[PDB]
Design a protein around this ligand. Sequence first.
Ligand SMILES: [Mn+2]
Ligand SMILES: [Mn+2]
Length: 363
Amino acid sequence: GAFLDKPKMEKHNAQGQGNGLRYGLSSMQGWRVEMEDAHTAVIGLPSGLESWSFFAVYDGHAGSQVAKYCCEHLLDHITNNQDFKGSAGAPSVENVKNGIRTGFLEIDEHMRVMSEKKHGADRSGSTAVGVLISPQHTYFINCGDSRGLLCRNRKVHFFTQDHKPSNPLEKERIQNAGGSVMIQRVNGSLAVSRALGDFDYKCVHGKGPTEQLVSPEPEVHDIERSEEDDQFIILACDGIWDVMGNEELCDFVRSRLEVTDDLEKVCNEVVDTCLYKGSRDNMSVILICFPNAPKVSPEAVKKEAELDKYLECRVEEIIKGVPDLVHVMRTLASENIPSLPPGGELASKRNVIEAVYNRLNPY
Ligand SMILES: [Mn+2]
Ligand SMILES: [Mn+2]
């Protein structure tokens, strides 16, 4: 299968600000032979929704086609249907939720007809996770096993529930559609129960679009915004979540925000940390900060400089037969060094350690 001999570490970054928001994002191919993640990040939506913003991560499988079409058109499919448009002037909460549902079903069918029409060869699919942010609400959207969370008052206030085939209601739909869940996979193949695309899994006669083996139906949750307490939102594919839990990553991110306000850098730190914790998948993360996100702290910046210098000295000493980097890391780990970043741990300091190691053993 895939797997490069060495991971592609190149970061693709973007950032932006507006509507009281700031964001950064990072995508990295990592160990995989292809990059099949995509993302959307837009502040200010068309058609009278200038005060709105939209962010999403798409984890494509068996190709990038579906993920790429979604990252460019999911939003307009959501906002440009009668369900979303309700309505008086501003969409009600129901307009928004129904509009998102219709947008997923409609883009799915749209891609299906395009593929049938142009004799598409690909059999790809994609997850989608995102947030539609209005002046007063954050609407979390989830379809698949990517995941998003909201940090409010230093805690995980909300996170999306991953759609896995073994989940009781998912298993039930799958069985009723003539399939089975083998371990964690639909018919022993697909590890997600919900996705756009995967049209081979949506051919069950006598079942509606949301009753197929794989469903395009999103789960939507309206969270009323709190100007005082809302801190940040994280959206990421399973390349991140496979190796860091909700509270770990939330704690980690807060730790990094106390040290820098460069959101691209924070996202890069998350991605590298997850690579160093063993993630061999494509990785994409979007970090969206609200006005009361944690601020850079002079003491936090100092502590980090102290930790980095401490690590540099340890490496100098450990290096003295000249151990390889793997062995230096192993030694460092056995020392149970205090004050490492929460969640990120030693893996989150590997770039610092490797930089020193490289200076001392450049060949
Ligand atoms: Mn993928
Ligand atoms: Mn993935």
